[PDB]
Each structure stands twice: as structure tokens, then as C-alpha cells.
């Protein structure tokens, strides 16, 4: 509790005794992607709360009939300006839902619309527990503890605190691999990603944000289960695949996908969480935290790629530049 | 209405009456999972009391939702009825006390053996919309909502499905030249994106993973029309092919916004707009739920032309049914 963001603590204190039967994870792009692990956590842990995840404008237009006074809507926007997420917060609040927004900017429009606001840390100095993923888990595990007496909160928070060391060790261990990846993918026009379970949003974000948005590299995040029902026909020794293996219950799906890809593919970039040091993380939560480490490592891969391709990650031709 | 419902589906609905169900799980793999996306949209817009979730079959088993149990309904689909993950998912759900209904083209299959209820569907050139996999799925879905929640759209859904075959015919005729043009224009394109939102997203997903990747070895990715403006749109330029679907559901504005942008910065666009088809015999209450079926049928004609132009039969595979995996 002492490690929990003070705004999240206030939210959790107010949440006690409330009747909530549905949680909606609502954001756009990268901010939506960071919520996939939380939907996995709810699916594995929540006995009485329905969980759904939608892109912000999808949420508004789909207008779930179950959205109302017994709903909790968790929103996220880095800048706090993403118009669809701002509108989603107002829409949910107008329906009587309890709303909490996460942002890097506290005076933003999203902050102004949401009932509760939690800021996260960002940049080279940010510690895992205080990052967007860290704060989202404080809210998620906290909610489950307050509303269902879920017993994993302490281990989730202690795990997050210990996760910064895991990040730093993982990053050092993968430095040469990140450089090799950049060298090997300098001129590849398409790079697929693949993962399952709690790790699927990490692959999705890498595909839509790092590769498409920030590198203009074609991508597609293939779900490791779905792979064997169509997509796998695309692989050959020239098709690059980034394959993620986590520590959650779905790891067998990723293992199966990897085994096949090693046989018929060749240009494989494998990030396996089992190769990192989770000895200080409780077994009850290491599957839920592995995506955070995988995501952090991927960032170092992105940095090397950007440098090697002379395409800065901040470069855009449309976002913030034209009307849309 | 009820007279047009598959007899097996009618028996299931009869038995469903009075049961307490608080959660529906849509479980299948690949193309069979994609056909369930519209049903998830229907549940989101119509069900006041039933939680709906959708997963690929092996994800369902491994994720092992804690809310899966005696008050769950699990709807599964497998064409051959042999898909091992779907077969195991049926057994898994049934073992947890869930009510299970499997759709398949083969009633003597392992999936049919595991599922408590079995509903077959028709397939091929002679199959009418109402009797196809999408048709039977909606009989189950709207039927379930009518039986458990007194949902009022059942009659209009069933009548709409019956009238939808005529929509397919007119739409196919109207799109025949476009299908040929698409094939000629995409003969040598290595990557082709698809894009849609709401109840139409599974149609795009299936086209990407099944028609393009699986059956043509063409790279693809189904972009959600809302998500597009938060990263993926940076990829478009005049040389990137995009297939864009515009439906008739509440999310059409997302599709319209995406198209508008794509027309300004892209060029190789293949646009299928459900508003250009004839839904005059379909009730307004269900047009948005039925449009994806029509979009899907038209896309199949595009696939047929493409396969011919590329001399790559849709039945061709290098791994599926040929190697161990």
C-alpha cells in the first residue's frame, strides 16, 4: 500500500463498498495495448466482474448496453489530449460509470473529464512500478483486492518494485541482440510479431506503434494460437518474425509457434521471458509481469533499429501534422 | 420465424428456456473464430444480463476464465469438426459444467461428439444465407437472447436472414467487374491491408488471415478503423493496397473517417460499402448486424478472381494438412 500511487490509493479507498459488475478498458493504440495484460488478469482472477476492452471510438459507438452505474471505466492517454479517449471518458461518466484516467499530463482534457486521475512516470528515470503499466496494475490488482478480496495485491506490488532490477538485467543481457536485430532488419519491409495471452498486447503495440507508426515497416501481430489456422502458411526462410514467449498459462501456444517457425522459417527474433531473472518475483504473478519486461526489452530493439535505419522514432508524416 | 430455424437449434432453444446463463463464450479457431465477431457485437448492443467473451480455442483453454462454469454457454465452431483445439475446448467447457453448442459441417465429427448440442450448417454454392455458418450462428445468438432476455429482434433477424440471400445475389452481380479489376490490380502485390470496425472487423480479419495469408500467401493485417489513426495510418502512401469495408452498424463513422483519410494519402484502395447494396427488405433494427454477412460474401468473389489471376488455388497449402505441427 505504501508503494501505491497516492491518487490510486484515494481511488481504492473510495471504491470500497461500491457495487461494480463490469470494467471497461478504454484507450487508443499504444495506450489500448498496455491494457491487454489487465484484461488477462481479470479473466484469470475476477469471479464477479465482467471485463471488456475496446478502442475509444469503438467503445463509444458500440455503446455497450451493460455500461452504466455499476461500471468502472479505466482510460489512458499519454498526452491526455487524444480526442476519442477524452470523449470516451465524458461518455462513460454521463452514463453514471465510475471513471479513472491515467495520463502523463494532469492538466489535460482527459484529466478534466475523468472522475479520478492517476499520473504515471515516463522517461529514462522512471521505475517500473511507476510507469504506465505499473500504475495500471496498481489500479487493477487494487480493484480486485477491494471489491473481491483478491489475495494477489501484495505480491503484484512487491513484484513491480522488484521488476526494475529485472528490466536493468534484461536490458544488459539483450544489448548485443538488439544491435544484431537492427543490423539484420535494416532493409526488411515487413516484420511480423507473435505472442499469446498476457503478452499479445506487447506484440500488437510493437507492430502498430514501433514498426508501422514509428518506422514505416509493415507488420501484423499474429496470435500464437490463431497462427496454426491460417497465418503460418506465410512463413518461409525469408519472412521475419519477432516471437515472444512469456511466463503465463498460454506459454505452450508460444512454444508451439516457435517450434514450427524454427523448422520452416529462419529470420526469427525470439524474446523469451524464461531467459530473464524472475527469482525475486512471486510465482503467483510472474506471468502477469513478464509482458512488462518483454515490452521494455523490445524498446531497446526499437532504439537500435531506428538508429540503423536512420529513421528516428519521433518521425511522422501524418500524426500531429495533417488533419484527420 | 421459428419455422425457418434449424431443427437442432430449435431443440436447443426449447431446452434453454428457464436456464440460468450469465456468460456466453465464443470459442473457435481462425476463420471459425472470425465468424463470431458480429455475434459479440450483437451481444454488446443487445444483452443486458449476459457477459460475452471471444477467444481462439487454445487461448480459451489456457487462459481458463475463472467465470467459466455452470452458468456459462459456450458456442463453438469447426467446419470439419476435427480442429483439435476446438474439440478440446468443447470437452474442457463441458467438464466445467458449461452448456455447450457446437456448429459444424460434419455431424459425425469429434467436436460433435464432445458438444452437448450440435447444429449443422450448409456450405457450398447451393447454400442459402440463413443456413450458412453465419446464418446458423445468428439463429443461436438471437434465439438465446429471445429465450433468456425476451429480446425483441428475433423475428426481424430471422426474416432478415431469409431475405439476405437475395441481397447476396444482387451484391455479387453488382460487384462482378470490381472483383475482376481487383484481381488484375493485385496479381503481384506482396501485401494487402484490410480495414473495418464494429460488427465488420471479423470479416476483415478473416480476409487477412484466411484468404490472403493462408490461401494466397499474401501478407496482410486487418486494421481496426478506430485504431488506424493511432499509429497504423503512418504506413499508407500511394503504393500500399488497402481493402476498406464500410458497414451499416453504429461504428460506420469510424470506417468513413478512415476512408476519407485513405483516399487523400493512399491510392490503391478497394472499397466495399454495404450502403451500396440493397437492404430495403431488411428491417432497420438488424441491417447493421447483417451487413457483415453480405460484405463477407462479396469478398469471397474477390478472392475467387484473385486466386485465378495469380494461378494460386484457394485450396493450396504448404503446411496445413501436409506437415506435423
Choosing among 3.40.190.290, 3.50.50.60, 3.40.50.300, 3.40.50.10490, the CATH entry for B1-152 is 3.40.50.10490
Assess if CATH 3.40.1280.10 describes domain A1-151: no
Cell of B312: 494460386
Instruction: Tell me which of A38, A204, A208 to substitute to probe the interface with B (most B C-beta atoms closer than 10 Å).
Output: A208
Decide: residue B322, CB within 10 A, 0-12 exposed, 13-18 middle, 19+ buried: exposed
Strand partners, B54: B26
Contact A44 B65 (CB under 8 A): yes
- Chain B residues within 8 A of A318 when measuring between CB atoms: 233-234, 261, 265
- Count of C-beta atoms within a 10 Å radius of residue A82: 24
Q: Could you tell me the CA-to-CA distances from A302 to A134, A211, A216, A308, B157 in Å, in that order?
A: 21, 8, 12, 10, 48
Q: Could you tell me the CA-to-CA distances from A48 to B23, B108, B110 in Å, in that order?
A: 11, 37, 33
- Chain B residues within 8 A of A230 when measuring between CB atoms: 30-31, 209-210, 213-214
Of B29, B58, B86, B325, residue with least CA distance to A252: B58
Report the helix count and the strand count for chain A, using DSSP H and E: 12, 9
**Nearest chain A Cα distance for residue B230, angstroms:** 5
Find the residue in B nearest to A227 (Cα): B30
The C-alpha cell 497465418 sits at A231
Of A44, A220, A316, the CB nearest to B234: A316
Of A44, A62, A216, the CB nearest to B251: A62
Torsion of CA A254, B215, B183, A211, to 10 degrees: 10
Kind of pairing, strands A268-272 and B23-28? Answer: unpaired
CA dihedral sign of residues A34, A40, A42, A45: negative
Asked if B89 and B60 count as a contact pair (C-beta separation under 8 A), the reply is: yes
Question: In A90-116, which positions are buried (b, 16+ CB within 10 angstroms) versus exposed (e)?
Answer: bbbeeeebbbbbbbbeeebbbbebbeb
Residue A25: helix, strand or coil by DSSP? strand
**Nearest chain B Cα distance for residue A73, angstroms:** 16
Cα A202 to the center of its chain, rounded Å: 5
Query: CA-CA distance, A87 to A178, in Å (whole number)?
Result: 38
Cell of A107: 492538466
Report the helix count and the strand count for chain B, using DSSP H and E: 12, 9
Scanning chain B, the segments in alpha helix (DSSP H) are 7-16, 31-34, 37-46, 57-63, 84-95, 110-114, 133-149, 154-185, 201-206, 215-216, 252-265, 287-309
DSSP A138: H
Choosing among 1.10.10.2240, 2.40.50.140, 2.130.10.30, 1.10.1270.20, the CATH entry for A152-188+283-309 is 1.10.10.2240
Residue B60: helix, strand or coil by DSSP? helix
Asked if B324 and A259 count as a contact pair (C-beta separation under 8 A), the reply is: no
Query: CA-CA distance, B304 to B300, in Å (whole number)?
Result: 6
**Nearest chain A Cα distance for residue B190, angstroms:** 10
Asked if A66 and B52 count as a contact pair (C-beta separation under 8 A), the reply is: no
Query: CA-CA distance, B104 to B133, in Å (whole number)?
Result: 8
Kind of pairing, strands A221-223 and A241-245? Answer: unpaired
Give the H or E element holding residue B101.
strand B99-104
Query: CA-CA distance, B176 to A2, in Å (whole number)?
Result: 66
Q: Could you tell me the CA-to-CA distances from A283 to A159, A169, A247 in Å, in that order?
A: 10, 19, 9
Torsion of CA A197, A198, A202, A207, to 10 degrees: 20
CA dihedral sign of residues A17, A18, A23, A28: negative
The C-alpha cell 521505475 sits at A127
Query: CA-CA distance, B144 to B184, in Å (whole number)?
Result: 44
DSSP string, A231-300: GGGG--TTS-EEEEE-SSTTHHHHHHHHHHHHHH---EEEEEGGGS--TTS-TTTHHHHHHHHHHHHHHH
What residue ranges do the domains of chain B occupy?
A: 1-152, 153-189+284-310, 190-283
**Nearest chain B Cα distance for residue A235, angstroms:** 9
Count Cα neighbours of B76 within 13 Å in the Cβ-side half-sphere.
36
The C-alpha cell 445468438 sits at B141
Cell of A24: 471497461
Of B192, B216, B212, B220, residue with least CA distance to B317: B216
Q: Name residues whose C-beta falls within 8 Å of residue A169's C-beta, 6 or more positions apart in sequence.
A: A276, A277
Asked if B142 and B42 count as a contact pair (C-beta separation under 8 A), the reply is: yes
Choosing among 3.40.50.12570, 3.40.50.10800, 3.40.50.2300, 3.30.479.30, the CATH entry for B190-283 is 3.40.50.12570
Domains A1-151 and A189-282 share a fold: yes
Query: CA-CA distance, A257 to B172, in Å (whole number)?
Result: 38
Assess if CATH 3.40.190.10 describes domain A189-282: no
Cβ-Cβ pairs closer than 8 A, A with B, add up to 189
Asked if A231 and A179 count as a contact pair (C-beta separation under 8 A), the reply is: no
Query: CA-CA distance, A224 to A244, in Å (whole number)?
Result: 9
Asked if B100 and B115 count as a contact pair (C-beta separation under 8 A), the reply is: yes
Contact A318 B233 (CB under 8 A): yes
Of B144, B89, B139, residue with least CA distance to B111: B89
- Chain A residues within 8 A of B45 when measuring between CB atoms: 62-65
Of B108, B47, B101, residue with least CA distance to B77: B101
Terminal alpha carbon distance of chain B: 44
Asked if B74 and B116 count as a contact pair (C-beta separation under 8 A), the reply is: no
- Chain A residues within 8 A of B66 when measuring between CB atoms: 43-47
Q: What number does CATH give the domain B153-189+284-310?
A: 1.10.10.2240
Query: CA-CA distance, B281 to B160, in Å (whole number)?
Result: 7
Amino acid at each position: 500500500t505504501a508503494k501505491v500511487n497516492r491518487e490510486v490509493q484515494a481511488f481504492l479507498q473510495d471504491l470500497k463498498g461500491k457495487t461494480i459488475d463490469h470494467v471497461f478498458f478504454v484507450a487508443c493504440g499504444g495506450s489500448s495495448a498496455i491494457m491487454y495484460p489487465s484484461k488477462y488478469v481479470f479473466d484469470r482472477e475476477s469471479k464477479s466482474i465482467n471485463s471488456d476492452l475496446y478502442s475509444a471510438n469503438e467503445f463509444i459507438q458500440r455503446n455497450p448496453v451493460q455500461l452504466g452505474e455499476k461500471s468502472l471505466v479505466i482510460l489512458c492517454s499519454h498526452s491526455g489530449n487524444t480526442p476519442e479517449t477524452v470523449k470516451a471518458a465524458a461518455f462513460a461518466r454521463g452514463k453514471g460509470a465510475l471513471t479513472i484516467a491515467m495520463t502523463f499530463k494532469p492538466e489535460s482534457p482527459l484529466a478534466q473529464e475523468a472522475q479520478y486521475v492517476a499520473q504515471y512516470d515516463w522517461g529514462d528515470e522512471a521505475l517500473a512500478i511507476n510507469t504506465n503499466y505499473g500504475v495500471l496494475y496498481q489500479i487493477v490488482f487494487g480493484t480486485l483486492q477491494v471489491l473481491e478480496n483478491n489475495t494477489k495485491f501484495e505480491q503484484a506490488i512487491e513484484g513491480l518494485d522488484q521488476l526494475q532490477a529485472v528490466y536493468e538485467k534484461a536490458l544488459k543481457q539483450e544489448a548485443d541482440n538488439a544491435k544484431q536485430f537492427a543490423k539484420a532488419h535494416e532493409k526488411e519491409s515487413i516484420i511480423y510479431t507473435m505472442a499469446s495471452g498476457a503478452n499479445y498486447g506487447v506484440a500488437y503495440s510493437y507492430s502498430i506503434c514501433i514498426l508501422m507508426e514509428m518506422q514505416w515497416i509493415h507488420s501484423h501481430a499474429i496470435h500464437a494460437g490463431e497462427y496454426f489456422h491460417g497465418p503460418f502458411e506465410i512463413i518461409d526462410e525469408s519472412v521475419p518474425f519477432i516471437i515472444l514467449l512469456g511466463l503465463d498459462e498460454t506459454r505452450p501456444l508460444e512454444e508451439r509457434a516457435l517450434t514450427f517457425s524454427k523448422k520452416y522459417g529462419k529470420k526469427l527474433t525470439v524474446l523469451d521471458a524464461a531467459s530473464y531473472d524472475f527469482t525475486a518475483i512471486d510465482d503467483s504473478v510472474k506471468g502477469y509481469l513478464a509482458p512488462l519486461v518483454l515490452n521494455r526489452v523490445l524498446r531497446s530493439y526499437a532504439d537500435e533499429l531506428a538508429e540503423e535505419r536512420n529513421h528516428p522514432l519521433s518521425h511522422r508524416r501524418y500524426m500531429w501534422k495533417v488533419e484527420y
